[PDB]
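Example record

One chain of 120 residues, shown exactly as stored in the release files.
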Amino acid sequence: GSSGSSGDEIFCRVYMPDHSYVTIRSRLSASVQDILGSVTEKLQYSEEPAGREDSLILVAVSSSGEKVLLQPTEDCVFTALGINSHLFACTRDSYEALVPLPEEIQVSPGDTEISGPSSG
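Predicted structure tokens for this chain:
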């Protein structure tokens, strides 16, 4: 038997439009669809890979508002995504409703950014 050797697996996080991401374990060779399916599972719907959905599209949002509608036919996502970037999975009419996460010393992708005493 064996567990692994190198281990490239990572934990993708799909930031919600209401500010509430999840922790999903994915590989560095997955796809938007793959993740979606995974995240979708995290979403309160059911114990299935398809707990009823109304078309969910991924989108990369950075600390600025730079949205980049991704595709289900991607290759290197986890990598493509910069540092201060967050993935958002929502409908097409919600894509805009999407908002870029803040910039604090809290739950974030970058972390240890030590912005400064600049509240606002």
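Notes: The first helix runs from residue 32 to 42.
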